[PDB]
Ligand binder design. Sequence first.
Ligand SMILES: CC(C)CCC[C@@H](C)[C@H]1CC[C@H]2[C@@H]3CC=C4C[C@@H](OC(=O)CCC(=O)O)CC[C@]4(C)[C@H]3CC[C@]12C
Ligand SMILES: *[C@@H]1O[C@H](CO)[C@@H](O[C@@H]2O[C@H](CO)[C@@H](O)[C@H](O)[C@H]2NC(C)=O)[C@H](O)[C@H]1NC(C)=O
Ligand SMILES: *[C@@H]1O[C@H](CO)[C@@H](O[C@@H]2O[C@H](CO)[C@@H](O)[C@H](O)[C@H]2NC(C)=O)[C@H](O)[C@H]1NC(C)=O
Ligand SMILES: *[C@@H]1O[C@H](CO)[C@@H](O)[C@H](O)[C@H]1NC(C)=O
Lengths: 407, 407
Amino acid sequence: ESVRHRIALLFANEADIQDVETVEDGVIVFPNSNITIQDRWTYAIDYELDSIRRISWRNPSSTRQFSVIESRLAPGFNIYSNDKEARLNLFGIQPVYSPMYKSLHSETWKSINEILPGGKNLNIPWNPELCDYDILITANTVQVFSYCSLVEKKKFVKDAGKVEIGLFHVDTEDEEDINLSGLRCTWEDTSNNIGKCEKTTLFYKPFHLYVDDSSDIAPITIENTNGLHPKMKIDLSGIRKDKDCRHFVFSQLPSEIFVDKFQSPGSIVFGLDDLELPDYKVNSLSWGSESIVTLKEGQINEITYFSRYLEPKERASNKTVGFEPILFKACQVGKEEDLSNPFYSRSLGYEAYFSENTKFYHINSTSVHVNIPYPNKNDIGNIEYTTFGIVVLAICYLIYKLLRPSR
Amino acid sequence: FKLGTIGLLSLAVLLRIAFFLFGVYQDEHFTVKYTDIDYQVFNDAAWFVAHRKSPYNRDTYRYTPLLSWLLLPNHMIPWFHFGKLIFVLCDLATGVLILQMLKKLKSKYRYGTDRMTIMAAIWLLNPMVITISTRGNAESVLCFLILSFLYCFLCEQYLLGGLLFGLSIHFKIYPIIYALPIAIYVAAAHYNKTQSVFKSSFKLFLVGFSTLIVLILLTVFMYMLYGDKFIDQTYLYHIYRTDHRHNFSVWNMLLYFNSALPKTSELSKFVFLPQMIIVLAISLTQLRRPSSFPLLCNVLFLETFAFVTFNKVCTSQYFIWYLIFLPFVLYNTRISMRRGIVMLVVWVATQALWLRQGYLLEFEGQNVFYPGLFCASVGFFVSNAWILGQFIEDTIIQNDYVYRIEP
Ligand SMILES: CC(C)CCC[C@@H](C)[C@H]1CC[C@H]2[C@@H]3CC=C4C[C@@H](OC(=O)CCC(=O)O)CC[C@]4(C)[C@H]3CC[C@]12C
Ligand SMILES: *[C@@H]1O[C@H](CO)[C@@H](O[C@@H]2O[C@H](CO)[C@@H](O)[C@H](O)[C@H]2NC(C)=O)[C@H](O)[C@H]1NC(C)=O
Ligand SMILES: *[C@@H]1O[C@H](CO)[C@@H](O[C@@H]2O[C@H](CO)[C@@H](O)[C@H](O)[C@H]2NC(C)=O)[C@H](O)[C@H]1NC(C)=O
Ligand SMILES: *[C@@H]1O[C@H](CO)[C@@H](O)[C@H](O)[C@H]1NC(C)=O
């Protein structure tokens, strides 16, 4: 059916692979210790075009730890497109322009089946609350990556199109030159019975490194949480600057929050960077802003997240809004190493700022919330009348004071 | 005892130096950023100018380009505190001009007693003015210019007075309000020496022509150099401004609510009429006794007080606009001590109440927009109006015993 399916089973212990049952028409697995599932669906469509599109969804509230076979997706539902002629207005979200792409962002899950080209329907178990999705649309191919966790016994059989399965375990590594070892199996085209599995070894140097284990390298703090402009403080005093390592904070903010890009050197802000206009004056321009902010090593770095004024409505109340910036250190590596692995590939996103030969070390992703109150839109008449009456009385009193005879 | 003028100047210089050293040491060591945001804006504009680029690329920079040109030695010479030194020098020049003005006036107009030291120390020995000058605020420079042209009017140097008046008008648009009184004085200033209307009218035309030509030449030169953005950000902003951030002004909440609405109310476009009416009414009092410099100074002080009080925006930095004129008003004042104490107490109490409401709103997110902020603004405006009326009564009483000592 012009479908190709690739399944990846990331385990934690070598003995866990023993528990895997290989029946003549499938593979039955019972979870042992928080294994990871990576599903890759590939389609071929004509779709004559010369642009790339990315649709990445990661649950903001998700607490799942990233694996070596998964990229660090930007939190929330994001759509990037590098085309400079088509218009991006899906779901009523105004795009944000950047020298490489137009981007749409949201913090709540949206339906994806209406965006997938060709009107293709397939047996996808959309589980937005417990899975991470990444859809890549190319000139002639469509790829769908789903990262999930197994919490129950599952049986994999011959799905639509060609099917290939691979179970891997992470051997000894030094957070570089990562080696996976395990089994690879394929499904016959003429029958629903599995083939003969073979030993396989994959060697690759990742460009997405996770150091989120322990040792509180760069603690994150938030001060003035109740205030309108809470301060985000990052501690890098104990870490010395390296030759090619530069730390950064990447934040996708809504239209009600902006960052003064002149606070720190080497900060880039795309979208609504206006420092004066309120929320109701720039709400319809775009969905917000994307900011990448550099940090100075050896000293505490402070970032201010200002908030605008919201349009008054009936029954005055506050409109708390949250966002999650991510802290990552980017290091340049010589242009000889092959920074390519079969699992994930570079594409549009926050990686488009940096070059091709970069490696990211993700440290912390502490989330922030801002409370913004608005008044009641029923006191306009009272305010008008009181203000004008007071002003008129004051000028009348001053005029009376002026007319006083001399001597 | 009686302080010596030389000793007063020396102690003022010592205070300025000590505060500057405090500032530089605290900036270097403490992570509190004593320097104000305005100095950061000016420094960024100076950097843009030094890199052969328009200073208006820096957001929220609406000053004239001359400020950035003056601060250029920040980047021409590798230091950051040069603007602070220039502002401190301007503040010292302002104090010296105040002392010289009082000394010259005491020998031409009959005065009550000897009070040069106290009235000079009102400005030269104020930690508030010291903090304003040493934090990078540029107001002092404007203040200096003002005194300069006024001094040129005292010593019958009308041409340089007109040139400096035009320069100050170019720097900030508000000194235009001084045009109506000063002109009258100039005419009378020549009627008491030469009994020929021709010479006085010619001198008035000369000073008007000089100030107009200086203003127009500076405007044309700046526009030609820096494009339409200069004209926009310098002139049209005051026309399309929608300042809604909390401030001492009475029109704050009204302007916020009006900016919320898409169509302005009919009785909401006359926010400029009361200010013009009261300014003209206060200006007309100069006719009581022309050819008098103390009366002119009092009229200018009342005009500045009324303009700041009725302005659509008013913060803690707008007070200095009239504080410079405080000594000349208070040299021959007749207010009882209890009345002055009452005025000061009411002023400070209203300011403290508004500051508490604003701090609650900013650092706690509470909804104190309609009931809290508006009432505090109304109370502050009423107190300011009462103080202005009292000062007008004071100047009307003063105008009596300010006879000349002509032979
Ligand atoms: C921004 C730059 C251009 C400097 C701004 C300051 C000057 C324009 C001011 C500061 C000191 C002023 C001077 C201070 C004292 C005098 C002496 C004064 O002479 C008299 O009193 C003449 C009558 C007499 O004494 O016989 C005439 C004005 C003048 C030159 C002033 C002219 C204007 C000056 C040069
Ligand atoms: C990421 O930031 C969190 C902030 O909560 C760090 O967790 C805290 O670290 C401090 C040390 O600075 C401990 O005292 C706390 O007990 C930790 N937990 C909490 C809930 O505050 C975490 O260590 C940081 N991670 C990295 C890799 O820097
Ligand atoms: C708006 O602000 C109010 C005032 O704080 C919030 O009310 C409390 O919020 C805390 C947040 O942890 C809750 O635990 C309390 O139960 C809330 N008290 C109430 C609702 O009476 C409120 O959460 C804010 N956000 C809204 C109303 O959406
Ligand atoms: C759950 O997963 C985490 C990492 O994802 C792992 O460290 C832990 O051991 C797992 N739980 C168990 C019971 O093994």
